[PDB]
Structures are given as structure tokens and as C-alpha cells.
RNA sequence: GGAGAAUUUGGACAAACUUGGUCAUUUAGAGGAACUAAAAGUCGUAACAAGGUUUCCGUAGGUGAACCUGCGGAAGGAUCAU
RNA sequence: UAACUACUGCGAAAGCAUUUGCCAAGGACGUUUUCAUUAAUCAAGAACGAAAGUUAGGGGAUCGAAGAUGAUCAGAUACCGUCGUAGUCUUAACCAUAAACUAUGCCGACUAGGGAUCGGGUGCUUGCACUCGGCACCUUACGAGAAAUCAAAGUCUUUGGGUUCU
RNA sequence: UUCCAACGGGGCCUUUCCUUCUGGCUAACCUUGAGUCCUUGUGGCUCUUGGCGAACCAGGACUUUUACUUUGAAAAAAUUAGAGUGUUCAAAGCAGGCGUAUUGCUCGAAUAUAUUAGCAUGGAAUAAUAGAAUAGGACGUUUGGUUCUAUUUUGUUGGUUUCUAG
RNA sequence: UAUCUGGUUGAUCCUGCCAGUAGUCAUAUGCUUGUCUCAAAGAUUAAGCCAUGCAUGUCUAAGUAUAAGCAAUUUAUACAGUGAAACUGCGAAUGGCUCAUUAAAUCAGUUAUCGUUUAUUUGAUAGUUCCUUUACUACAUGGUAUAACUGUGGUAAUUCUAGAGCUAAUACAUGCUUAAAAUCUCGACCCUUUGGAAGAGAUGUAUUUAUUAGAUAAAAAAUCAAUGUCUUCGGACUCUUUGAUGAUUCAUAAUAACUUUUCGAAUCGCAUGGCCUUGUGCUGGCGAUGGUUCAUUCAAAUUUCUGCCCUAUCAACUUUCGAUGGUAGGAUAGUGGCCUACCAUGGUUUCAACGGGUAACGGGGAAUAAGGGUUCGAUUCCGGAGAGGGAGCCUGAGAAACGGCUACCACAUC
RNA sequence: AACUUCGGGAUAAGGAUUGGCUCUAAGGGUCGAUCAACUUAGAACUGGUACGGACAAGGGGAAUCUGACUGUCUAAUU
């Protein structure tokens, strides 16, 4: 809730509501189609949240690799850790070993809990670690 | 390494120039120019190695400074000028005109053309967007900006170019049924008809290509280059015509020539 | 009639030097106590035969030295047997 | 805790034997009961673990490390003989080992005859048979093995059921 | 040639997902305005008139998820394997070879492998995974409520209720 | 290119090692050595130290010549040929060397920039510059200020340079230039008209911000803000413009302003022609260098996925004083805890984190090779890093450069 | 830090800070009003870089001999 919790005022940049044009419809909320057959959630279009890093209602573009994984942490604010499990072939033994990698991921307030499978899309470096944005939820 | 590299070692050269390993240590590094480094053929290679006119890199300069040789109708004095695919090398003396085009092995042929054909070249359109003061332009594969194009022209279409003027005479839309020259990969130099295009959003589009002997093959859309309609090449093709015979079938065609 | 040298305030970057701390890697050392070469010397005779007290295990004590003794095991025993 | 006492039983192993109560536990068998893959083996981590040994209370018959002591002997603070401290028993704590041995990991399947026996069950003509589950045992060796030998130590160069440890 | 087959591949039907619909285009061939153009009637046409769109492109619409395997693509050159070629042979090299040797013709500098990862593609055995059980389940031309969305109009921006159309 | 043999015993069958055997673009060394081709070579220890020499400079028809330099044979009272010097420009960021550092780092394959800079090349691309536009402002062309050079000197000594006097520019600093038109605001004047019009200013490009367009899922009309059609007049009432992407606040175009106001050629050669108004009139060829932006090419930077040797006698690590994330700012070419402020309590780990070791630069590859493997890769190619050790930085498109500078440390020279 | 009887050793060793002024924040009682203490943390400014400003107030470490420890005695030389 709230939206205006931070010290600064939260707005989508270059999106002018204009008090002069008096209409009681709604504020101009911008959004985009992310691409690659990813549906924009209703919560993105309807909801009030501001997120510079959301791939629907923000300035990040999804391009490069799409990955999936299970959600293993939801204790950071607007970001999560997922686990990508895989098998690694050792050719001497003609056998495999279970390996895994954690990938930290930005999650828009459009969406997710521990256990869920998510699809995620590559975007420009968002933080020190995060280079991936949740773009679909599947549980 | 601090800034751009000015040399190129003989082993690190493109294979398709067919430089000998021993005679040297460096190889002619293509200057910056129309074509990408690995996709070009320096004039020094064309003159010395391929036509056998020059014997040294001094003699190549002796020829270039006479102001005989001209690439797309303009004289060049750069031994390592990056000439590339569809370019027209015109020598004044001899009155030989050549077009650089790939034989089937994936190497530039000595393909002599008539003086009429040397008026034009084809140009695969790379991007088409709106310039300053709303003026639309296209960008060809040799990096020519051409302003005020036909609004029918979209990306991946070929475009016939006048050279003297440097204007769009005619163009060919990219669709199923068009003849193609494959300009990269394993199938570099093959010729064949488009069958269908696979999309793949946020990836690489693929192009299924039949040929005259009914051998299909797929390439990336980046490697394709439209050159006409079915059985109607705009340019003149080299000997072979982008067929690709087996090593067996090739060895049988030697035994015809072996008779003498 | 604007450039403009020495000089100078605060700042970040920060070599280097003292000083502790810590980790790694080498190395000296009176003396001590082992091991090996090692089989030959001295003293016994512990083991191999019921090796002359069957042997061996764990433990505990004894002590020139091998070893000896208690308690509980084992047979790889010198008994597959009432 | 004799004799009874065995190629007999029970227990994860160490172990466990006079009587009768009380307290929970357990296998096997029987089952036209119930759930429905919940399992097998397991780094880490845990419980239990003969004897000896340790600390502190009880107890202290017998045997007995040390020690005393008489023989033997070249010696004999060794065997043998007479005593005897801790110890041997118990309560509360420790210890974590043994030839803790079947010197044979566990789970599953298959491969061969035989009679004994322990527990449950079934049939009976009531002491015998069948059956499941146990401790074993006898013959052969198909196989296996360096051999001794082994019904598992077999089904491994015709080389792969699962898994831990060394 | 047809046939004798063997071995592979695709599409039909048999209680048989073969994603679904919305305009491009109906190409085609049971659409027939001149039928016999024509080798054994299974080795067959000169095109008109809605057609029958799985022959073939972009659209919303939502699509259990892997592993494995096929094919493709990729994975610099050199090096490796390897084709051609009498460096006098060879290691090598990438040359060379035929003419009227007096104004020249011509073949070459292949090909293969290189996974684990990623990409595209066919398969759907094997192995995992999800689904309707307190039905919050499926399909639906139903039959209402409710919730927003905005296209050619209604001159045109704009105010603005509906019928629509999703 | 699937091979074994000798050695425990008195003899035997085993287990099991030791020894033999063959290879090594694998080093040393010994002895020996006629010929042809080919050819590695101070890596290993000491990324230890270095005397001397050399390894980066560069000029065309075409930036700057009064060399008191060489010519001259006669193209010239401006210069005109060939040219030391010096200014200007470009280069010196490549190459070559080495392997010390470095173990998710480097590197390999594979992605990305809708996350940025880019000398040069190549292709496009610039009538809009004076501002009182009737004061001045040269555009038949604008300002000094300097080298080399000539003199006068210093210093033991150096690729040290002072003082004085000259003089160039594609150096430096200024500064005019040339077609219409349309559209907007401002508005003189008259007339209250559904009123409209002199003439006034602005409108290139770049810079910075704010705002606006950048449509689209098919068919109907109501109701007008009406106050605009088109005068058939019941107000017929149509036709409108919209590129690309999987995807954008994209390209691009408007609107209002902003700016220690960017650029928009005061430049150079060789040809010398055509118009006549024969004045040095107007116009004109081939091409050199330059320049704004976009594209291109040569790059650069960051970046996604998966992959690394030994070690548990390293099991917890990171978070004071950035560790993980959020918001805002700052800084950067640009993304990002890259840094700062504030807030949250996160992030990694037995699928081996963290730590230690490496006689570890990674890879292409090499050796050996039944099949599977084992060992090596300082070293000809590719990538990285370094230039005694550290840090800082100027110049420049590009360097945290070392045959650049500055400092400290170590070493060493006159 | 060694060492340890696991209690200690320990204020080990060794460092940094401290004024004045002007602010900020947090921490309560009684019936949204109302009343009230001192504690702690932070920031700005400021000065001859001072500031536990007088007073008050541990030197520390490595070892050895010896007595375990606290305790007690030679009033008037131990
Ligand atoms: K005392
Ligand atoms: Mg270099
Ligand atoms: Mg004896
Ligand atoms: Mg004995
Ligand atoms: Mg254990
Ligand atoms: Mg043991
Ligand atoms: Mg930011
Ligand atoms: Mg090293
Ligand atoms: Mg190497
Ligand atoms: Mg080394
Ligand atoms: Mg050195
Ligand atoms: Mg460097
Ligand atoms: Mg440096
Ligand atoms: Mg040097
Ligand atoms: Mg250098
Ligand atoms: Mg102390
Ligand atoms: Mg202290
Ligand atoms: Mg005392
Ligand atoms: Mg006294």
C-alpha cells in the first residue's frame, strides 16, 4: 500500500497528468507490451505501484536469455532468489552430477512465494547481482 | 590492448584468401572501409595472389598509384582497400571488369563481366529508418546510405544501384520463390530458391533453401542475399552456379578432364 | 583590460614509513628421545614342536632385557566327538 | 545361579539361565482387516557398547594384579606352593575399546538333493505330513576359488540388480 | 517397365488433438461453358461458377515441466585425420599441368572430426514431473447481473448515453 | 597401434611389489660425428642486475620557405626549381618481449547493449550565421604573437636554456557571407462584424529541460463545445497522415524557452575555358585538406549461460568502515553499491561456500595412445597481464602508457 | 596472546574518542486531551586541534625461586 512511502515523490517520468484538463477518469498510467508472448498482468495496468525496474510499467527492456527456476527466497524487497538445478556430464564416468546455481531476480509488484516456478528475462544490470526480471508466474 | 591493432599475422588471416604459410609472417590487414574485415578481399590479394599481375606488394602500389584500378567506379590508392561481395573492380588497361562473387568452396572467384553489367551492383538493405528532417534512408550491405527510397522497400530486400549516380534503379522484395546467394557459413557460395522463413522472436530467423538439384539446406537470415526471381539472376553468376557437388561427383568431373 | 606564474583552502585518490595484529613459507639450536643401515658383539631364551607355563586380543600392574601376572575374550588350538 | 544345559532359545550388538509379581517392548505365524510407495543403503549427526580402568558414596564372602613369602634354578622379585592390597558386587557419573570373529557389510532376486530341530499354522486318525519363519547340519558341485574350502565365498573377461565402508 | 520382395517413410479409417480460430488465396481438383485430347480402362485432360483452404502466411487467443536422442547450425587459422599433386625420393610445400613454348590455355588449393554449454529441428520408448476428492473441477449456442475496454460513424477535435464488438 | 619377462620356495600355486622393455616437438649430460633438406635455442634458477650501440619517426602537384643553402638558364619585381631548419599535422596506444601476478578471476564456446564511446575508412549530409534587418560591420579577404634565423650570455655537467631583436599559418584568436515561401505569435487601423488586415518579430544545426504527436479489434447512429464546412443550404457533412521492433518514453517531427552559444570552409594545387558590360566584369573544370550530424568500418567497454588443479590437519563465510536489496542523488561514455544519504536485513554454503596451497597465466594444442584413459601446454596463433616495486597523471579518438611525466620505496650512474 | 583447575588470565597487550553552542531522535504517566523525569544515540556550527582542561586517577610485558589461595604474628629494628 501507500506508494508514496519514500522521501522522494514516486512517478513514471515524462508522464504528465495535467490538473488543467479536469477529468475524473484516472491518472495517466503508462505501460508496455514486454514482448516474446509475455502477457502484461492486469495488476500492472490497473494497480497504482511505481517501479522503475518493472518490465511492464518501467524503463527496463527484456532481451537475451529467458530462464526458469524455483523460488527459494522472498525476503528482499522487490527481488527474489531462484534456484536453477541442472545435471553436469562427467565424460570419464559416462554419468552426471546434480549441480545448481542461484540467480537473484527483480520481481515487479505486478506478481510470488517460495515454491513457485517462474520464467525470468534478461535485462540491463539492475543491481550488483540482478540481471533478470520476473516475466511470468506458474504455480 | 590500449588501442586498435594495425597488424594481422598470416595464420590469423581469413582462410578464404588462400595465402601461403611460408612466404611471409604478416598478411595484408584490410583498412577500415565498406565491408567487414573477415568478409573482405584486399586489393593486394586480388591483384597479386588471384590475378597474378603484381608479384610483390611494391608492384601492387605501382599499379594503384597509376590510377588504373577503380572499385565501384572510383579510383583507390590503398593496397589494403576492403573490396567485398558484389563489388565491381574495373581496370582501365586490359578493359577487364570483374565482380567479386563467391564460388561454391566459399572463396572469391575471378569472375569477368561485360562493361554493361559493371554499371550496377546489388545491395542487401540492412536497416531502413528516418533520418534528420524526416528524410527516410536505407543502408546497404556495403554501408551506402541512400536517401528517399521506395516505401515498399523493407529490411532484407536487395536493391540495384547505379554506381555513377548511386541511386535505386530497381529492387527485389524478400519472399518465397526468390533466388538467393548465401554469403556466410558452411553453405557460403551456394545458390538456391527460398522455400520458407522460420520466425523465432528475439532470436535468429532461418531460411530453408532448395537448389536446382533438389538439395534443401537451412541458413540464418543474416547469411542470405536475394539476387533475383526463380531462374532470373540479376547479375551474371560464375561457373558452377552455386550447386555444391559431392567430393565423389567432383572427382568424376575431373576424370572427364583427365582424358586429355 | 582579458589572459595569467609562484603561492594557497578544503577534498577525494593515495604511494611510503613507523607500530601492533594475523596467515603462509623457509631456517639456526646446547641437549633429549627415537628409527634405520643391521646381519655378525654382550646378556639371556620370549616365539616357532603341548617350544618345554598352548599361543594371541583388549585392558591393568610389575620391570636389565626379551617378558611376567590378573580380569574378560578368541582359536588363527594341542579338542569339530558322550 | 550347578546338575537339567543341547551343533537348543531370545536380543541391534555387547549380552541374557533359581521363583513369583508389576511395567512397557518384540519377532514369527494367522488374517477375503487398513493406508497406498510411505521404501533400500546411507557422508554429517546420534543411541547402545564385554573386561579392565577412573571419581565419589555403600559393600567387602571368594578369588586375586601389585606386594609379601617357601621352593625350584647359574639366576627366577617366573611358572609351582601359602598369604594378600586394588580389584572382583552395587548406586551416581565417566571411559568407548576387544581375536567387540562367522576374522565373511546391508537390501533384493535366482540357482540342488537330504534329513533332523525351534516357533506358529493347517490337515488329520493324534504322530506323522504339509506349510511359513528361525538356529544350524549332512551329501554333491552344477558353479566358484591360489588353495584351504564355499548352497554362498555361486549366477564375474559370456565382465552392469541397488547401496555404504575399507 | 510392371512384378518378385526385403527394408525403411508418410497419410487415412477403426469409441481416435491432427493447438484454436480470424482474413490473405482459394492454389488445387468429384466445381464441368466445347467429353472422348488418350501405351494394358488402377502405366489418365483442353477450364467455367460458390467452391473443400492443412498447400501457405501474421493475427489476437492460451499454451504442465524437464531429462534423453535424430538432423541442422555452430564450435578462427595452424595442428590432427584426409583427397589431389613425382618437392629428383622423403620430411615438407600448396603447388602445378597441357599448347603452335613466336605474344596462351587450364585443373587446384577439397573433405571429415571436435561433446560438456547455448541455439533451431524431428521422435515421444525410457526416467521424472503436473492435473478434478471438503470439487473453488470441465465443456456451453444457455439465461441474468457486474466489470471495464473503443473501432468505421453520428462534419471535425471535444463533451457524451446506447446498439455493439471483444 | 589389444604381447609381457627376471626376482620370495627344497619344489609349487598365489597375492604383491622391485627390476627389465618401448615412446617422449623432454630437458641435461657423456662419448662419437662425412653429406643434403629443415630448424628449436637464457622458459625452468634470478619478473635478478645491466657498460656500450641500436630498436619511431614522418613530405606530396596540393598547410608554413627571403636558409645571409644549393642551383640556376632565363615560366615572373610577390612567390614559383630542388630543398636543411623549425612551426603545423599525423604517428609514436601498433609491433616486439615476458609469464610475475592471477582459481569463477583469466580464458573457451555462447549471448546482450531497448546500457554506451569510437581517430580513421566508406556512404550520406549544411541558401536559414549580420541582429535594429536605415549606422558601419573589411568579405577584392579581418587581428597579434611566435618558432626556426641573427646577435649577447650563463653552466663542471645533460636531447639545460635566459635576455634582446625579426617574421609565416590548414597554429592561435576573431568575423561577414546568398533563393523564395509558409507558419506562428505580437499587433497599427475600423467595427461591434459567424469581423481582417497592414508590418513587427521569430523559425538552420548543436546544447539543456518541460510538454505534444508518434494511430489501428470489425460495424451503427444518438447527443453537440456547436460556431467550422460548403453555399444544392434542410447546415450535403466526405476525404483525413502515421516508419521500424519480439518489445520502448524508438526513429523522427512539432511546441515553449535555455546556452562562460557548438558547427555552418578568411585554406591549398593543377588546368585555364566561356560570356563582353574587354572592367581585371560576371560565370566556370579536375581534387587536396577541412568540418556538423547520421550511417558504416576498425575497434572499445560492460555483459548472459555453462565449464577450472590439490586441500576439511580449512565448516561456516559476508555485514564496524557496502555485505545483499530498496528509494533519491552524485559520478561515468554509459549500466550497476561504482560512490553518498536514508531505509530494510539480507547474500553464499556439504550439489564443498569461506580459507590455504599451486615448482597455476587461460585456450587452440602436445606426448602416449585397442577401447576407455593418464600426463604436459613458460614457448610460433588467439585472449589476458606487466614493463625494478607501488600509486598518481598529462597528452590524446584511444594509455591509468613506462624506449611519457610526477612522487615515494629499492637499486644504481656522472 | 600464552597458559588454564575452563571459573579465569583480563583494565592482558594495544588503539581511537571526549569542550562549547545550536539542534534532531528514541525511550513515559493520567483521564484523543493533559501532565512529567532524566538517560542514550546522532547531526550542524565553533576555537591558537583545545577539551576526564583544576581536582581526581592502573605503568606494562617475557620468565625463574618460593608459599596453593583469603587469613595470622615478633605493640617499640624482621
Ligand atoms: K594472604
Ligand atoms: Mg601489444
Ligand atoms: Mg621358549
Ligand atoms: Mg611357550
Ligand atoms: Mg559416521
Ligand atoms: Mg579395533
Ligand atoms: Mg541510480
Ligand atoms: Mg607463476
Ligand atoms: Mg601457454
Ligand atoms: Mg615459471
Ligand atoms: Mg629487470
Ligand atoms: Mg599496460
Ligand atoms: Mg606506469
Ligand atoms: Mg626499455
Ligand atoms: Mg613500448
Ligand atoms: Mg599475564
Ligand atoms: Mg588496554
Ligand atoms: Mg601465602
Ligand atoms: Mg617489630
- Residue B13: which of B51, B54, B41, B55 has the closest Cα? B41
The length of chain A in residues reads 139
CA distance A34 to A13: 18
Give A63's contacts in chain B (Cβ within 8 Å).
202
Q: Are strands B179-182 and B191-198 parallel, antiparallel or unpaired?
A: antiparallel
Q: Which residue has the cell 535468429?
A: B204
Torsion (CA) B160, B161, B162, B164 in degrees, nearest 10 = -170
CA distance B192 to B242: 7
Å: A97 CA to D150 C1': 40
**What are the counts of helices (DSSP H) followed by strands (DSSP E) for chain A?**
1, 5
- DSSP per-residue codes, A6-51: SSS----TT----SSS---S---------BTTBPPPHHHHH-----
Which of residues 20-39 of B have CB within 7 Å of strand F? 30-38
Task: Check: CB of residue B101 under 8 Å from CB of residue B181.
Answer: yes
CA distance B124 to B156: 6
Tell me which method was used to determine the 3D structure: cryo-EM
Q: Which nucleotides of chain E are near protein (any atom < 7 Å from a CB)? A: 56-58, 61-68, 72-74, 76-78, 83, 93-95, 98, 106-111, 115-121, 149, 159-160
3-state SS, residue A101: strand
The answer to whether A36 faces chain B, any CB pair under 8 Å, is: yes
Amino acid at each position: 500500500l501507500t506508494v508514496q512511502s519514500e522521501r522522494a515523490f514516486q512517478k513514471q517520468p515524462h508522464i504528465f497528468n495535467n490538473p488543467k484538463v479536469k477529468t475524473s477518469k484516472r491518472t495517466k498510467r503508462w505501460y508496455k507490451n514486454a514482448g516474446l508472448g509475455f502477457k502484461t498482468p492486469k495488476t500492472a495496468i490497473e494497480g497504482s505501484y511505481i517501479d522503475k525496474k518493472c518490465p511492464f510499467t518501467g524503463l527496463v527492456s527484456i532481451r537475451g536469455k529467458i530462464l526458469t527456476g524455483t523460488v527459494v527466497s522472498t525476503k528482499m524487497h522487490r527481488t527474489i532468489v531462484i534456484r536453477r538445478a541442472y545435471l553436469h556430464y562427467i565424460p570419464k564416468y559416462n554419468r552426471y552430477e546434480k549441480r545448481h546455481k542461484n540467480v537473484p531476480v527483480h520481481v515487479s509488484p505486478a506478481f510470488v512465494q517460495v515454491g513457485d516456478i517462474v520464467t525470468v528475462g534478461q535485462c540491463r544490470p539492475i543491481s550488483k547481482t540482478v540481471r533478470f526480471n520476473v516475466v511470468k508466474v506458474s504455480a | 590492448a590500449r588501442g586498435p591493432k594495425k597488424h594481422l599475422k598470416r595464420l590469423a588471416a581469413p582462410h578464404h584468401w588462400l595465402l601461403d604459410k611460408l612466404s611471409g609472417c604478416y598478411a595484408p590487414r584490410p583498412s577500415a572501409g565498406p565491408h567487414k574485415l573477415r568478409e573482405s578481399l584486399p586489393l593486394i590479394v586480388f591483384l597479386r595472389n588471384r590475378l597474378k599481375y603484381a608479384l610483390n606488394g611494391r608492384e601492387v602500389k605501382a599499379i594503384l598509384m597509376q590510377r588504373h584500378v577503380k572499385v565501384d567506379g572510383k579510383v583507390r590508392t590503398d593496397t589494403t582497400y576492403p573490396a567485398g561481395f558484389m563489388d565491381v573492380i574495373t581496370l582501365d588497361a586490359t578493359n577487364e571488369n570483374f565482380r567479386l562473387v563467391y564460388d561454391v568452396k566459399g572463396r572469391f572467384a575471378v569472375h569477368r563481366i561485360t562493361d554493361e553489367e559493371a554499371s550496377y551492383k546489388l545491395g542487401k538493405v540492412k536497416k531502413v529508418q528516418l533520418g534528420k528532417k524526416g528524410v527516410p534512408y536505407v543502408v546497404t550491405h556495403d554501408g551506402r546510405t541512400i536517401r528517399y527510397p521506395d516505401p515498399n522497400i523493407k529490411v532484407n530486400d536487395t536493391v540495384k544501384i547505379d554506381l555513377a549516380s548511386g541511386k535505386i534503379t530497381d529492387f527485389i522484395k524478400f519472399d518465397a520463390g526468390k533466388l538467393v546467394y548465401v554469403t556466410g557459413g558452411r553453405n557460403l557460395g551456394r545458390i538456391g530458391t527460398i522455400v520458407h522463413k522460420e520466425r523465432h522472436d528475439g532470436g535468429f530467423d532461418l531460411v530453408h533453401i532448395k537448389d536446382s538439384l533438389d538439395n534443401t539446406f537451412v541458413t540464418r537470415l543474416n547469411n542470405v542475399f536475394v539476387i533475383g526471381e526463380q531462374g532470373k539472376p540479376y547479375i551474371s553468376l560464375p561457373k558452377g552456379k552455386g550447386i555444391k557437388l559431392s567430393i565423389a561427383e567432383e572427382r568424376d568431373r575431373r576424370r572427364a578432364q583427365q582424358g586429355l
